[PDB]
Write a protein that binds this ligand. Sequence first.
Ligand code: FUL
Ligand code: FUC
Length: 113
Amino acid sequence: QDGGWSHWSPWSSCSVTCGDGVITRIRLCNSPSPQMNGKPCEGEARETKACKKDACPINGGWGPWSPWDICSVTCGGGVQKRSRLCNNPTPQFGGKDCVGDVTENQICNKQDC
Ligand SMILES: *[C@H]1O[C@@H](C)[C@@H](O)[C@@H](O)[C@@H]1O
Ligand SMILES: *[C@H]1O[C@@H](C)[C@@H](O)[C@@H](O)[C@@H]1O
């Protein structure tokens, strides 16, 4: 009794919901399975195909902070600024916006005036 392949199983769904992945389907050497010294089934027991979905969301990421602006003062109470860019990367395909402020403030040179 030589082995015989069962019918293919239904194709699975895409391995991913976005971007590229694969759909798989399987067979069993059980229709009939091989007996002792009978020929085993010839071929593949699994078949992986490829599926392509829409691009995955790209969440925003902050770029480097700009250098601190020079202090508005040399003694008592200064305020210097600093800025950011949400373009490393820029949000795309429904990705989340960067979290946080685009600009930063801080007191400086607050000392003996
Ligand atoms: C599965 O992957 C996530 C990241 C989103 O792209 C969903 O829309 C998709 O179903
Ligand atoms: C700037 O502030 C003035 C008042 C002086 O104290 C300078 O020495 C400082 O750089």
